[PDB]
Amino acid sequence: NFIVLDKYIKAEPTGDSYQSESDLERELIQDLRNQGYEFISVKSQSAMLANVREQLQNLNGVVFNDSEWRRFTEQYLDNPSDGILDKTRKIHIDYICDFIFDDERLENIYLIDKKNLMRNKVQIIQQFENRYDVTILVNGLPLVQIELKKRGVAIREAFNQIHSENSLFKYLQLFVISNGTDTRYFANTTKRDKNSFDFTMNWAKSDNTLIKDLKDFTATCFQKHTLLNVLVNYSVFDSSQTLLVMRPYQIAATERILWKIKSSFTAKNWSKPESGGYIWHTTGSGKTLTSFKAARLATELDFIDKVFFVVDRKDLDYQTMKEYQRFSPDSVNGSENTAGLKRNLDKDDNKIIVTTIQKLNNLMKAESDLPVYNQQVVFIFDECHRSQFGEAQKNLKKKFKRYYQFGFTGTPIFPENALGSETTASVFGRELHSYV
Amino acid sequence: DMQVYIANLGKYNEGELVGAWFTFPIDFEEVKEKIGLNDEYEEYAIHDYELPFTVDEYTSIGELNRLWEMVSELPEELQSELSALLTHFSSIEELSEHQEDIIIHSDCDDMYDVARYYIEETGALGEVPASLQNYIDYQAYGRDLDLSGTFISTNHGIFEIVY
Amino acid sequence: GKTFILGYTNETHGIYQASKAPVIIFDDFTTANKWVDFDFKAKSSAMKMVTSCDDNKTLLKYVYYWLNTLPSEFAEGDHKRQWISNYSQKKIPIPCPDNPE
Amino acid sequence: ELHRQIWQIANDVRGSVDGWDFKQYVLGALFYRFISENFSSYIEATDDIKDDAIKTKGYFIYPSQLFCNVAAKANTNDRLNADLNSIFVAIESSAYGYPSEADIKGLFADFDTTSNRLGNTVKDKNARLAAVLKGVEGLKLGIDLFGDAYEFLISNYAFTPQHVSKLIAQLAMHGQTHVNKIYDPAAGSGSLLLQAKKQFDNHIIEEGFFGQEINHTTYNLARMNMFLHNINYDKFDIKLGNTLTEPHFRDEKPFDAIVSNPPYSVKWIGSDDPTLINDERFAPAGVLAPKSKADFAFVLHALNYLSAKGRAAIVCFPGIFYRGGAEQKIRQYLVDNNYVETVISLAPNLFFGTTIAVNILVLSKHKTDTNVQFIDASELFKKETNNNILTDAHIEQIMQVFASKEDVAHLAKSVAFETVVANDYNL
Amino acid sequence: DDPTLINDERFAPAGVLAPKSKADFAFVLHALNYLSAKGRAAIVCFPGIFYRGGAEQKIRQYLVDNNYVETVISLAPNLFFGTTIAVNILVLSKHKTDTNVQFI
Amino acid sequence: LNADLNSIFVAIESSAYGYPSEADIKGLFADFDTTSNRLGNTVKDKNARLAA
């Protein structure tokens, strides 16, 4: 079901003392084979390339000759004039290429089955050609770098102590650096002291508790669905260009939200308070970012028709829109009024609609049963029922029926700053996930 | 058209959310009876507006009626394109300075029509011989007027800010 | 150019036609073509109109001449420039203070 | 409404580049919707607004005998609309190739070659094609006013306006219900052959509206042009390539009425790089045309393919003026008999992206026996922009002038053949 | 400006900022950003600069706050590829006399 | 590169003159050779177009 589970799996070492970078790696590989990964021995370059036309036969289910494979390798796979940035774009955006056969039919060569992640075949390899390294290579392409260190290599100098042809290793995206007592991980950004332990992440338990060891780290994050959802569903390739990785508790609460959708939709229930729920991420969230990811996953999640992430306004609507055209492609604003907003409810392909609560109230005081009424629609509020109580909520329970009523909030019921609105417990149901 | 959601700074987090929409003219005591009070005077929390322009989060209501009277002062085709016209300018009294200085073209719809108007019917050169009738580069004439003149392409026509 | 393209319907088109001696300025970007608005005339598309406020002194065929008393700065049309300050402000030698009589 | 849907095309689908590039995509989606509606209408002769995959080859051969495009079981635009906004692009690339398999008989195919595409990324291509298919899908098209949209869309700003084409047709037509019509050399569009069917909806088609044309995209749009007007499969086809190099059919046949619109002074290098001195169409000329024109190759080609009731209505820039002794003996061989009969000049402009006055040559193997010119300079109704249009019954005035050899003042008339040989063969 | 070019090194000395269309006047603001007193800098602009109203007057006034601009030179239409307008050459150094220059 | 007709192979004008186009050692100044490296449309219509 989930990715981050509430129960915590056991922690063990694989030692084979970690001062040597050649022994416990083998036990790690054998644990991955116990997780169902496949160690092959290609300590070379060209045959590894042929491994790609090994995998894609399995992947897209179609057959190359040699010449079209040279065309695909030259023109799309291993364009030599390109760096890590556009190749990262090919990871997260341009992961499909059209191709014309000698039969002259156009077929869409994929790279990752982002629909059925279980279809995607994985492999694991290790050191060759320097240092002693571990490489997780999925569907032919190498993705995850793993380097163990000594006990002497401190967590601050995990990066601060250590740091064509071949150009095939340019596809490497994640720098998962370990030492024996800790493991951190980050994107394709290698600044010296700013991207140290502060900007990298330890893995954590279900709610808050961080992880230090290795084999438990393996049994958590190196799972099949887990590592793929890391690589696909929770990777934010900002068009800075900068890849961003979400916090683990962010991903966990997102999983709680989407699984709540999955559970309530198959139970064909709507409009209950306990069908809702809310998140106390008042700080350390990137509530913009986490809301964007949850919203886009709702849009692709296809149970529904519309996702209304609504807020109240004090330079918020222009702000987060500006935050989300950073997250480049698609978001319909609530500009400028409830005139063409109905055209926006008519419109799709730009599915996420963001507006003020007061524009919505200008639609909900009147306007007499909009055609998106009895449709499956998810209302992602912000500043939950401790900061919304009135005409929105009462005409929400009055008018609207098939709403999935969620919301991030920095405002649950506090003793400190609860001068916003009414209760949340019998209105939005129960609290779901929180962070200090 | 031109209505604001303004209340209240009491319970600053948009608690005591009252007062739906206020078309102009807008009074202190009218909104005050709409909202009561927040035991003191901290109100007109500007958070939402149907306005054809850009307004600020703490603009006083007398200034709001001032802006509305400047809107109602202007002709309605200019009231429709205040958003486009204010791009060149910065305020409305500024716009009220050169409100005489706007050339309106419902007749002209692109730059080509502007060139054909200012050449043919204006008669900026006189003779149009039949040997020369086709042979007036309206495209380059529009490029040169675009270099010189301040032009704005709108829905209802083309507006020339001539000084 | 010349002061005559032919007739039009004067009924219900707001054509001014009635002071029997105004003047004009043609052109925008030329500022040299001068005509006395003689009899009953339209407002056709570039006729930036000039008459007087004080109609006791001016006798504006006077000032119709007084434009072309200076052709050396007034009546030279060269580029794409409007000259509102140039014909608006100053100066003109006037036999004021024999005004108006 | 006609101009309302024309306005819908003039706004909605026009996005987001120059129209000559997305034109192919728009017209392809339009044509696919047409085949969808036509095939769905035909299979009802019982509620296929949604189909069923029950394809019977002994029954599906009957469209291949009859319409020669079995679309699919369930791969039409009405059935695309459910799967519209979904992965992926090349289902239309498949559903081009499959109905264009259809080898039985007389393929008239290799045809939907538009979408390749650009495009910059695959999701961008998918969203753009979804937008185009929705915008074509989001139209109000009833069932017969479908080609009018194609008439407007081909009449973008950038082509032989309809009254001029109508004038060519009425020049091509009087006292005539006689198989065959028509042949066209250098057809360009079929927009001038559109009025041929408006004439031939009256009695009947006679044979195929035979054209040959050079530019391959123009070739494809012309073939779908005369496909869209409910024109039957069997006869109506166009050959690709130059007519000056390789005309076909040479054997088939001496024709009875022919029209044209040749290009403007397009060159050709064949004099005499092959033995075109000793061909069948340039040999009675005695000389060949220079490289700075092509028009007389068309007209000798024309009078080659011509019957007793054969007439040739061709257009010209005034490069047929006198232009020297070789062009004299061209003109002389024309006035050797009553080959050329009347000429008609028009007034500038009347044409897109063009200036000059044009000329209309009328040719027949039929006695007169003199040249009776039928020429005005005005009118030539030059009020609507620009010399537009030769209005309805303004053209009938000109046809009435054409009718029986009239001699109207401030208008042209007969000349003597002795006068025009006493003249130096002028117009 | 929507970014911190509202409060950059060159448009905060400008006071009012470059509009959506006439941002040619930003470039001389850029040109003084890359400038020393001895070495002189020659730019050109199409002649839509008289001082272009109060939207650019202070800009012009900033340029005559000191002699940031030194000299101007006019030209003849065409003397280009089909303009047919002149331009205005603006030569900028902080090498002052000081006197206004109209040596055109 | 410029001699004949009917050779092998096709592709000489977009991609794979890589050792002058990339040329990382040193002072490389990329997008340096964005004109003609290796591809390529036909057999020696293409490469005899190059030849002639």
Short mmCIF file of N, CA and C in Angstrom, two decimals, chain A residues 312-314 336-337 356-359 362 365 383 387 389 417-421, chain B residues 3 5 10-17 20-21 46-52:
data_model
loop_
_atom_site.label_atom_id
_atom_site.label_comp_id
_atom_site.label_asym_id
_atom_site.label_seq_id
_atom_site.Cartn_x
_atom_site.Cartn_y
_atom_site.Cartn_z
N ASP A 312 -7.14 32.04 0.89
CA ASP A 312 -7.57 33.42 1.05
C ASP A 312 -6.47 34.32 0.50
N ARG A 313 -6.76 35.60 0.35
CA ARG A 313 -5.81 36.47 -0.33
C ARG A 313 -5.25 37.51 0.62
N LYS A 314 -3.92 37.57 0.70
CA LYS A 314 -3.20 38.82 0.91
C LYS A 314 -1.84 38.68 0.22
N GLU A 336 -9.72 36.75 -13.42
CA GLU A 336 -9.62 37.93 -12.56
C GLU A 336 -10.82 38.06 -11.66
N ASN A 337 -11.83 37.23 -11.92
CA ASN A 337 -13.13 37.34 -11.29
C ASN A 337 -13.88 36.04 -11.50
N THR A 356 -8.95 32.72 -4.96
CA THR A 356 -9.24 33.10 -3.59
C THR A 356 -10.51 32.41 -3.14
N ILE A 357 -10.67 32.32 -1.82
CA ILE A 357 -11.93 31.84 -1.29
C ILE A 357 -13.05 32.83 -1.56
N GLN A 358 -12.73 34.12 -1.67
CA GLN A 358 -13.77 35.11 -1.85
C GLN A 358 -14.31 35.13 -3.27
N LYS A 359 -13.48 34.82 -4.27
CA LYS A 359 -14.01 34.62 -5.62
C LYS A 359 -14.94 33.43 -5.65
N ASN A 362 -18.10 34.46 -4.23
CA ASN A 362 -18.83 35.19 -5.25
C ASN A 362 -19.48 34.23 -6.24
N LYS A 365 -22.56 32.30 -3.53
CA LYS A 365 -23.75 32.99 -3.06
C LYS A 365 -24.88 32.92 -4.08
N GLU A 383 -5.29 26.83 5.06
CA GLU A 383 -5.70 27.44 6.33
C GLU A 383 -7.04 26.87 6.80
N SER A 387 -9.28 28.26 10.36
CA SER A 387 -9.16 29.53 9.65
C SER A 387 -10.13 29.63 8.48
N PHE A 389 -14.64 29.27 8.32
CA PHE A 389 -15.84 28.83 9.03
C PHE A 389 -17.15 29.15 8.33
N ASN A 417 -2.91 31.28 18.39
CA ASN A 417 -3.42 32.20 17.38
C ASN A 417 -4.68 31.64 16.72
N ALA A 418 -5.67 31.28 17.54
CA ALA A 418 -6.93 30.70 17.08
C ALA A 418 -8.03 31.74 16.95
N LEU A 419 -7.67 32.95 16.53
CA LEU A 419 -8.65 34.01 16.30
C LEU A 419 -9.15 34.03 14.86
N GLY A 420 -9.04 32.91 14.15
CA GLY A 420 -9.54 32.84 12.80
C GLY A 420 -10.98 32.39 12.65
N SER A 421 -11.32 31.21 13.14
CA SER A 421 -12.58 30.57 12.73
C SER A 421 -13.00 29.53 13.77
N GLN B 3 -16.17 46.18 -7.50
CA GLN B 3 -16.65 45.94 -6.15
C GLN B 3 -15.58 45.23 -5.34
N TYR B 5 -14.06 43.38 -1.59
CA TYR B 5 -14.26 42.62 -0.37
C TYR B 5 -13.34 43.23 0.68
N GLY B 10 -9.41 43.61 12.29
CA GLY B 10 -9.69 42.91 13.53
C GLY B 10 -9.85 41.42 13.27
N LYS B 11 -9.15 40.62 14.07
CA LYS B 11 -8.85 39.22 13.78
C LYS B 11 -8.19 39.11 12.40
N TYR B 12 -6.97 39.66 12.39
CA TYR B 12 -6.11 39.91 11.22
C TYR B 12 -5.99 38.74 10.25
N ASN B 13 -6.19 37.51 10.70
CA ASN B 13 -6.05 36.30 9.91
C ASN B 13 -7.28 36.00 9.05
N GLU B 14 -8.02 37.05 8.68
CA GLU B 14 -9.34 37.05 8.08
C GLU B 14 -10.36 36.34 8.95
N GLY B 15 -10.15 36.34 10.27
CA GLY B 15 -11.24 36.16 11.18
C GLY B 15 -12.10 37.41 11.21
N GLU B 16 -13.34 37.22 11.69
CA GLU B 16 -14.43 38.18 11.54
C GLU B 16 -14.60 38.57 10.08
N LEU B 17 -14.60 37.55 9.22
CA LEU B 17 -14.71 37.78 7.79
C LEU B 17 -16.15 38.17 7.47
N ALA B 20 -19.41 41.63 1.97
CA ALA B 20 -19.13 40.83 0.79
C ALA B 20 -18.57 41.68 -0.34
N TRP B 21 -19.39 42.57 -0.88
CA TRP B 21 -18.96 43.35 -2.03
C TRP B 21 -19.55 44.74 -1.89
N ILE B 46 -8.32 45.21 2.53
CA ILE B 46 -8.37 44.95 1.10
C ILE B 46 -7.79 43.56 0.86
N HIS B 47 -8.63 42.65 0.39
CA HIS B 47 -8.18 41.32 0.00
C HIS B 47 -8.71 40.86 -1.34
N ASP B 48 -9.81 41.43 -1.83
CA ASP B 48 -10.34 40.99 -3.11
C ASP B 48 -11.06 42.16 -3.77
N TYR B 49 -11.01 42.18 -5.10
CA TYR B 49 -11.61 43.28 -5.84
C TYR B 49 -11.88 42.92 -7.29
N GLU B 50 -13.07 43.28 -7.76
CA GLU B 50 -13.38 43.35 -9.18
C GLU B 50 -13.15 44.80 -9.59
N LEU B 51 -11.93 45.08 -10.04
CA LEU B 51 -11.54 46.38 -10.52
C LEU B 51 -10.79 46.22 -11.83
N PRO B 52 -10.89 47.19 -12.74
CA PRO B 52 -10.17 47.07 -14.01
C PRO B 52 -8.72 47.53 -13.93
#
